[PDB]
């Protein structure tokens, strides 16, 4: 029974799943590891390696010397790995056909760079805010030589809207919509600040160790005092702050409750994705999360409501059948079947899903003739298939994360890494036609812009034989393909296309 893993803080449980085992011999993790969305970037001496969560190699970059000694590398919302240099910012587009692009300062005369976070820069002296535009900088509030006395980078953290910057005397928030300064506190000495996606705040003190989570000023949601010193204070995603102590994670909550999450080896760099707390170890990967109420009673040891007894009815079936039949006369067959259907949607092992689905199927025959819609069962059984197929090529995601970004967001991430056959197979099983030609146009553009020592007739023959498979008319515009063919020496092929 899966109830062994669950622990219990006040009124709720926290799951601890396990997926992905990445292998590095002794210390190939080293330091300076970038991690956003199952694209891990790690260096050792002179090479940059990018891997998935399954250990397979994906690409290699930083060969030869580009000068301007690198300080940091960060990912973003579109996985376009940004590299920050001393005098400019580099962005990488193509891995094998290298297409590194650079954006310098508007006036590289006095002061170049202090640091750079999501969509925000900071220069060394005269601390001023620059918003990252498409390929240029946008000015914001200007310092009057009275802003801050900050000593290191740990005194500021960006967010989608707020750009709260920690200080030593007064925290000064800035509205990025108009770049307007605004004082937030009058007496504090916080040294570390973390922010959530929804806008929650967390403030450390590193003296009389304590935390103070904020939703609005003058209101305190929690005064949970802390002992010793943390290392990688992080977030679980609009739920609760998280702290770790080497080989331990101490999840917290109201009234100073503690949760222990002992792990075998250690805890390396940590992320705070939406509703997730993806933990990277030196050998494996974990997906610390929280239970949900609909699935919190079927598997919970000891239950009375509809559910957790329909499963009991199915398990009892095939032996003492009269008892199983007689069980279905005490609980209404409405909530139980609904929970059973919307319980296997967010499961991981492909064994509990089968049991939940067949139990839910044995929940409709005894129900009323025409009282319950049958579309929910079909929708769930169809949405399981896409996630199961996705968890085959390397990319792993949950049902909630799949709602945040459309299927095109998933298709782009795999079209980026020169895998033009995998993508075309999701579209077939997902039963879609709108996003079909978007793969073909990218593949044709890359093929045309690839091998230059080709022949026109054979290239056209291949590019038109590959079009025979696709039978669909949407976003199949080849005018761009003809233009990019015309953009270089090949003119006859461009005319013939």
């Amino acid at each position: 029974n899966p109830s062994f893993d669950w622990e219990r803080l006040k009124d709720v449980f926290y799951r601890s799943r396990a997926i992905g085992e990445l292998k590095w011999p002794t210390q190939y993790e080293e330091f300076k590891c970038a991690l956003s969305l199952t694209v891990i970037a790690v260096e050792i001496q002179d090479f940059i390696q990018v891997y998935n969560y399954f250990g397979q190699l994906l690409g290699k970059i930083n060969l030869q010397r580009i000068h301007e000694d690198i300080i940091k590398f960060e990912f973003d919302k579109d996985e376009k790995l940004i590299l920050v240099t001393k005098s400019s910012i580099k962005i990488v587009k193509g891995w094998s056909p290298l297409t590194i692009e650079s954006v310098p300062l508007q006036d590289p005369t006095i002061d170049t760079i202090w640091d750079y976070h999501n969509g925000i820069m900071l220069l060394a002296k005269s601390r001023d805010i620059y918003k990252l535009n498409g390929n240029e900088w946008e000015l914001l509030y200007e310092n009057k030589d009275k802003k801050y006395n900050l000593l290191t980078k740990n005194h500021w953290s960006c967010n989608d809207d707020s750009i709260i910057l920690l200080d030593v005397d007064h925290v000064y928030q800035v509205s990025t919509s108009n770049g307007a300064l605004l004082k937030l506190i009058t007496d504090s000495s916080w040294h570390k600040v973390t922010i959530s996606s929804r806008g929650f705040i967390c403030l450390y003190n590193m003296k009389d160790n304590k935390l103070q989570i904020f939703r609005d000023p003058a209101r305190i949601l929690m005064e949970h005092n802390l002992d010793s010193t943390p290392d990688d204070i992080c977030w679980c995603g609009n739920d609760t702050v998280a702290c770790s102590f080497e080989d331990e994670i101490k999840l917290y909550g109201p009234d100073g409750l503690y949760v222990t999450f002992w792990y075998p080896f250690t805890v390396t760099n940590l992320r705070a994705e939406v509703d997730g707390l993806k933990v990277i170890t030196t050998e494996k990967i974990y997906f610390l999360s929280r239970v949900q109420p609909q699935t919190s009673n079927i598997f919970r040891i000891g239950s009375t409501e509809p559910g957790a007894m329909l499963v009991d009815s199915f398990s009892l079936l095939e032996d003492h059948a009269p008892k199983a039949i007689e069980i279905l006369k005490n609980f209404v067959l409405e909530k139980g079947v609904l929970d059973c259907i919307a319980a296997a949607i967010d499961e991981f092992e492909p064994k509990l899903q089968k049991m939940l689905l067949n139990a839910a199927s044995y929940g409709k025959a005894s129900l009323q003739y025409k009282s319950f819609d049958a579309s929910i069962f079909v929708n769930a059984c169809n949405t399981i298939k896409l996630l199961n197929c996705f968890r085959s090529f390397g990319i792993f995601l949950t049902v909630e994360e799949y709602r945040c970004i459309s299927l095109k967001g998933v298709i782009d991430r795999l079209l980026k890494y020169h895998r033009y056959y995998e993508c075309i197979q999701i579209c077939k099983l997902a039963n879609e036609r709108f996003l079909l030609g978007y793969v073909f146009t990218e593949w044709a553009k890359d093929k045309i812009k690839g091998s230059p020592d080709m022949e026109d007739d054979e290239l056209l023959d291949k590019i038109k034989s590959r079009l025979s498979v696709i039978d669909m008319t949407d976003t199949l515009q080849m005018v761009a393909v003809a233009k990019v063919a015309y953009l270089e020496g090949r003119f006859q092929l461009s005319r013939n296309l």
Partner: protein, 122 residues
């Protein structure tokens, strides 16, 4: 006594279930095939499902299940239908979409790879 009571209740339920179908067809109807329900046959199941007596037999042939697939293969759908009661009993057993046919397909071991990756890839 409990077994006798259960048997009596089961017999009463079975007797009541006979000739009490009272299933209804909606103004215009169709499913699975897509074209139109009222063109080939009326293989209808509970919980509002419709089949053409042909799409369903196509599904079982394409289904990953082995024993059921070969069991229907004795008639080959062409050898001899006899009284057609055997085919009627074999075909009408599952809902088509709400049964084990689609439940046992959520793992997808099928991955068509025939070295064609060298063509439509890389």
């Amino acid at each position: 006594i409990n077994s006798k009571n259960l048997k009596v209740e089961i017999n009463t339920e079975i007797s009541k279930f006979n000739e009490i179908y009272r299933i209804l067809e909606p103004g215009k109807s169709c499913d699975e095939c897509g074209k139109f329900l009222q063109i080939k046959k009326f293989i209808v199941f509970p919980c509002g499902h419709c089949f053409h007596w042909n799409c369903i037999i196509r599904v079982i042939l394409n289904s990953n299940d082995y024993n059921l697939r070969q069991k229907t293969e004795n008639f080959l759908k062409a050898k001899s239908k006899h009284n057609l009661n055997d085919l009627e009993n074999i075909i009408v057993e599952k809902c088509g979409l709400c049964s084990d046919i689609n439940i046992n397909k959520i793992d997808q071991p099928i991955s068509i790879d025939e070295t064609e990756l060298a063509k439509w890839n890389e």
